[PDB]
Amino acid sequence: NNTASIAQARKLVEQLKMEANIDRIKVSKAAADLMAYCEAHAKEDPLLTPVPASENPFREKKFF
Amino acid sequence: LIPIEFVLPTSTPETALLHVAGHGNVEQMKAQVWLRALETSVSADFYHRLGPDHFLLLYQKKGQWYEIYDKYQVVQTLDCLRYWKVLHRSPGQIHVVQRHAPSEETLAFQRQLNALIGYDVTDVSNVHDDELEFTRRRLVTPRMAEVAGRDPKLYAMHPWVTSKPLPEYLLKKITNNCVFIVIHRSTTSQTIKVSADDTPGTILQSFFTKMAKKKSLMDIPESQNERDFVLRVCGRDEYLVGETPIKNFQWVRQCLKNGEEIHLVLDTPPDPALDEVRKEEWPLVGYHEQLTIHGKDHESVFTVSLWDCDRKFRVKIRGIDIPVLPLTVFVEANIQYGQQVLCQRRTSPKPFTEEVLWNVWLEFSIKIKDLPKGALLNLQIYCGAQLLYYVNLLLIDHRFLLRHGEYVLHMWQLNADKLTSATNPDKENSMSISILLDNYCHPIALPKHRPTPDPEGDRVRAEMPNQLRKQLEAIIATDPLNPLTAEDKELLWHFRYESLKDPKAYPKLFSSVKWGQQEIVAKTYQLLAKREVWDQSALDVGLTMQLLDCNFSDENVRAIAVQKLESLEDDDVLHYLLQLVQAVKFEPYHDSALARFLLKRGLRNKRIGHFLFWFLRSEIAQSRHYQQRFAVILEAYLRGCGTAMLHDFTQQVQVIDMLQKVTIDIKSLSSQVISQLKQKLENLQNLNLPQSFRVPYDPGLKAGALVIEKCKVMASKKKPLWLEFKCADPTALSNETIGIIFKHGDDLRQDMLILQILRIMESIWETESLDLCLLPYGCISTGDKIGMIEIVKDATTIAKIQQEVLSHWLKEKCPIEEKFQAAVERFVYSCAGYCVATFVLGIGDRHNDNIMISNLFHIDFGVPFVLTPDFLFVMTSLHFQKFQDVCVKAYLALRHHTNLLIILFSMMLMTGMPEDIEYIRDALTEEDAKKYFLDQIEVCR
Amino acid sequence: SELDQLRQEAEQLKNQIRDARKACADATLSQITNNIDPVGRIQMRTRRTLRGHLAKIYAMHWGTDSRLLVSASQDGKLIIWDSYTTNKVHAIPLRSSWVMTCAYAPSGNYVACGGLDNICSIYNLKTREGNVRVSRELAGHTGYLSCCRFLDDNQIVTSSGDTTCALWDIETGQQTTTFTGHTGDVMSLSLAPDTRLFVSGACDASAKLWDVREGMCRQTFTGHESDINAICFFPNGNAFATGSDDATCRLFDLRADQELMTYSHDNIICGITSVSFSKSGRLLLAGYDDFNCNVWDALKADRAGVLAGHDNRVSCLGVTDDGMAVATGSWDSFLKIWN
Ligand SMILES: Nc1ncnc2c1ncn2[C@@H]1O[C@H](COP(=O)(O)OP(=O)(O)O)[C@@H](O)[C@H]1O
């Protein structure tokens, strides 16, 4: 039962080579990027900042 | 064209060499041989005179003879051909032998057996097929192998060995790893001590060596060696030899538990020749790929698989005709598979005449390929809809074919009663309904499912989401009375290799499988092909008693159940044997695997044989529905046991018969009645009422010549017979009369069960190292409303002692304070036992007319229980404390087997008795259970 | 020889990957985010309740209109709700009672669902006769359909219990691509705004980034001690969060190829059933198996609020495409919209 174990173990190493052959980015920059993304889109998120009830279809109005 | 040289019935003997048309089946060969005998034979006149049924086809396999009973068997099924090809026997030989008529020996034997059974076995006046007679011709080979596989000497002696570990509360009684054997011989009481873990051979050798120069004192011939003797209880016949530590013998444990001496007497081995079994002359009796129309030309077609038939099942209900009617009326037909209703149909109101006709057709939804092997065609005449009649009919038969033609059936009138598959024997006042199943130029032969590599289980091997597992294993760990909603059946039917390694789930896995289809059953017969996590599982026999219940009718679910049971041991088998008997009713056919199990069990033990005999006889005398099936089983059994057992059965039957005559005479109506009792009993003594009949509830306790002055008639309702025989064993260490009560008019199917269930409960408590000392008094049922009850002497009805009383009475009966306290204990323990057991069995509430304080026990099994003041007073609270503690402890001990209690309760209320099941859940309900149970006790107090 | 050398090559490349990740782990997100103002308390109110399901609700999915949403339930029906009006645009009864997932198509014409049937049944709302007709039975999976998301009217990705994912072409009803590599049952997936990548969560306590175009595993993220129950992409598409039975959430960045943040509390002991991001991504809404649905600050990792509107397990939850409302399904047979 070597042809199966070997064919499997090769897929593993061919996958790990895929994953290891990637140019990662410093965690600091990944964070800065995400923080400045939220900072950018913070206004456009009514769940983060409660928007006026008039703009809320669920509260202000029953006709749609 | 297969060449077979036939041994002709007549002659040097003449042999005919043919070219058998092996393409077809045995019928072609029969026609060919007949024509060849007609033409070739010089003695062709002989066979010309004789018809076709005057010769039989028997072949010699490995020396013996086998019968070609079914011409419908195909050439491949003829194992002779394959046997010859392996042996290269070309041409083969089939002996064409001439028939013969029975001899008188056989007829007398058959009449004897039919007298024993109470019902003919060769009756063919109530059967619409040969299921019964083929069951009988098939049970032979298993019986021949079972008998050939017996040990003569040991079976003759039938040692009653055991292998359970010794309970603690007995290990205190045993000390020093030794016991005291009070050997007897003639009158000498030679006491010798031996270690509690010695085989009887060692004990006998040691006794021989020690008294090798004084045995003449014991009054034994000096010329005899050790093997010339074997021990034996005194007052019974239970021999004690074999290979077992002398601590493992149920009678030794009984003695130790009740604290009584051990007494033995030397004896001789019952010779094996007395166990001979009379020779028997009766010679011993496809898949879907080979049995399909597709791929064949119509002129080479002989069979049509049940699955090719895409059509719908339909039936023709011609009408009904009753000799006399005993409103609106209308029929309803159903298909059923183990209490399931696959499809339903009915008709319209009709006049209520003595005969009605429709010639109508009723069409079913289920295709003829979707039918399962075991479908029941129920036929229900309702009236107005208050059911008034019923009858059932299998659709496939025992020999793997479909029913086709006109059928006239006799209806039963109005449980396991409604699942019967036999026709009323009342052929002259029963309602008869005729029907036609459309015919087929070829027969419809359902194959058996082929198990094939099913890789959904093979390559789904990682573990499943711990969310799905968590919602599945919460469902599985429910009651065995759990209603499986189609949600649950689905979730489980997809996880059909997850719950294949969880035995505690099996009667919840196969409760989901849909039997209405054909792919489902193929998948479910591939599921059971890899069962390495069931066979080698834990042999829990409180589970296997749910794979042999009403809801399951498959041919392999019950097979795995019985495979589990095959590994039990003799005593275990004995404990539940009443339900195993009650669990052959549901076997859809007559021949099954549970029946062959009981057969094979009864031919290597004797206590099992005796109790099996009495239970089968009771049902044959009572269960008119299945009486034919039970009679077949019993008669297939009675041809294997030894002659001596036959004689003992005969004598017991004679005694019971005579006693029944006297009883029925007596209840025909003062002291004149008593004198007439005396006269009848004396005449019966004169009329050969024997004095040697192993009392049925005890295959060792023999009752001897009656003691006439002691009998009487009680003044209660039924007024039974108070018989008092005397032991027929001279060596008895005492002379107490073997008592019996004989009672007419009270159903003895309840009290016979309840006693088994409390015996099992005692076994469980013993396994849990306790002893609440309940008394199971041997009760057996003999006919309808007639039973023989063992007598427990030293007894007195509670009511009587009342007509501080109970306490005073006790203090009196025990002059010594030590005996008094040992009594007060043998009273506390037992009152607790009974209180808990009846609070479980839901019968505690009744007046005190059925209780006998020997110890304490109850009689005449018709609030949690009765705990009247006198009892507690006999037991401020010190003994009252030991009482509560033993109560609660036993209560929880038993609540750890609510699975087994519920299964036995249900399987009992479904087959024994004449919203009612739920009481076992509330009653059975640790702190919570303890508090609830203690509440019951406090309320009664 | 060949297998021991290949095993030691595997276990060397593994520590090369661990070192390539530890190298980038220069600063933590909790440090960088110490400065930003905490999000505070997201006091949420139950705006709607969706009655009509007869049994447990297993899945739901908002439409691109931000108004319609499908929901799957144990009762064997697939209902389409109007969040604004609560009216059922469709109440489709299903062939299989054990439906486990549903997915409103972005186009709004098709809806899909599936479950124990091992088939992704695609339904058409805009049928020729206007009825709810089954367009396709996407068969081929060897296990229960665990999740699926429409790429378009003709393409849909589905995950299953066979430990693989698959891209389908609705027209051919055939698995365009097959995403092999998982070693466990795949509980969830999530399409990135860019349809060329999607992540999937499995019982192996790991997630995998797949290339829709090609069909390869690009990166594999670990850190969970138990099965991953839910996963979705960060609004931007460069990070994603995973919910697990280990009672902890984690955030993963693709470019940093490692864990950035953990969202958990000592009080939280039960597993996470569902997750969703706010339109901005600052808020992560996690469903729990304790009738609660805690609101976390994605950057601060602080539990801003809790959504407790159900009497039973909150199995599923979602966010509108406009981030205007939050739906939360539960085992109590009720969904609830939040604002
Ligand atoms: N197994 C037994 N052994 C000895 N005596 C018994 C046994 N069973 C019942 N009796 C006696 O029979 C009497 C009760 O008869 P029973 O048949 O119970 O009356 P009823 O049928 O009216 O209840 C009691 O006096 C009791 O001593």
Curated annotation (Swiss-Prot), chain A:
Membrane keyword on record: yes
Q: Found in which tissues? A: Adrenal gland and brain.
Pfam families according to UniProt: G-gamma
Gene3D superfamilies for the chain? Transducin (heterotrimeric G protein), gamma chain (4.10.260.10)
Gene Ontology MF terms in the entry: G-protein beta-subunit binding; GTPase activity
Q: Where are the transmembrane segments?
A: none
Report the domain of life of the source organism: Eukaryota
Where is it mostly found?
A: membrane
UniProt topology in membrane: Lipid-anchor
- Report the locations given in the UniProt record: Cell membrane
Q: Which UniProt keywords apply?
A: Acetylation, Cell membrane, Lipoprotein, Membrane, Methylation, Prenylation, Transducer
GO biological-process terms attached to the record? adenylate cyclase-activating dopamine receptor signaling pathway; cellular response to catecholamine stimulus; cellular response to prostaglandin E stimulus; G protein-coupled receptor signaling pathway
PANTHER family according to UniProt: GUANINE NUCLEOTIDE-BINDING PROTEIN GAMMA SUBUNIT
Self-association or partners: how does it assemble?
A: G proteins are composed of 3 units, alpha, beta and gamma. In this context, interacts with GNB2. The heterodimer formed by GNB1 and GNG2 interacts with ARHGEF5. The heterodimer formed by GNB1 and GNG2 interacts with GRK2. Component of the TAS2R14-GNAI1 complex, consisting of TAS2R14, GNAI1, GNB1 and GNG2. Forms complexes with TAS2R14 and G-proteins; these complexes play a role in the perception of bitterness. Component of the TAS2R14-GNAT3 complex, consisting of TAS2R14, GNAT3, GNB1 and GNG2. Component of the TAS2R14-GNAS2 complex, consisting of TAS2R14, GNAS2, GNB1 and GNG2.
| Role according to the record | Guanine nucleotide-binding proteins (G proteins) are involved as a modulator or transducer in various transmembrane signaling systems. The beta and gamma chains are required for the GTPase activity, for replacement of GDP by GTP, and for G protein-effector interaction.
Q: What is this protein called?
A: Guanine nucleotide-binding protein G(I)/G(S)/G(O) subunit gamma-2
Curated annotation (Swiss-Prot), chain C:
Q: PTM N-acetylserine: list the residues.
A: 1
Task: Tell whether Acyltransferase is among the UniProt keywords.
Answer: no
WD repeats located where?
Answer: 45-93, 94-139, 140-180, 181-222, 223-266, 267-308, 309-339
- Report keywords, A-Z: Acetylation, Phosphoprotein, Repeat, Transducer, WD repeat
Q: How is it modified after translation?
A: Phosphorylation at His-265 by NDKB contributes to G protein activation by increasing the high energetic phosphate transfer onto GDP.
Citing just one GO molecular function, the answer is: signaling receptor complex adaptor activity
Point out residues bearing the modification Phosphoserine. 1
Sorted alphabetically, the Gene Ontology BP terms of this entry are:
adenylate cyclase-activating dopamine receptor signaling pathway; cell population proliferation; cellular response to catecholamine stimulus; cellular response to prostaglandin E stimulus; G protein-coupled receptor signaling pathway; phospholipase C-activating G protein-coupled receptor signaling pathway; retina development in camera-type eye; sensory perception of taste
Of the GO CC terms on this record, one is: heterotrimeric G-protein complex
Which residues are annotated with the PTM Phosphohistidine? 265
Q: Identify the PANTHER family for this entry.
A: GUANINE NUCLEOTIDE-BINDING PROTEIN BETA G PROTEIN BETA
* Subunit and partners: G proteins are composed of 3 units, alpha, beta and gamma. The heterodimer formed by GNB1 and GNG2 interacts with ARHGEF5. The heterodimer formed by GNB1 and GNG2 interacts with GRK2. Forms a complex with GNAO1 and GNG3. Interacts with ARHGEF18 and RASD2. Forms complexes with TAS2R14 and G-proteins; these complexes play a role in the perception of bitterness. Component of the TAS2R14-GNAI1 complex, consisting of TAS2R14, GNAI1, GNB1 and GNG2. Component of the TAS2R14-GNAT3 complex, consisting of TAS2R14, GNAT3, GNB1 and GNG2.
Family indicated by similarity? Belongs to the WD repeat G protein beta family.
What this chain does, per the record? Guanine nucleotide-binding proteins (G proteins) are involved as a modulator or transducer in various transmembrane signaling systems. The beta and gamma chains are required for the GTPase activity, for replacement of GDP by GTP, and for G protein-effector interaction.
The name on file for this protein is Guanine nucleotide-binding protein G(I)/G(S)/G(T) subunit beta-1
Q: Which organism is it from?
A: Bos taurus (Bovine)
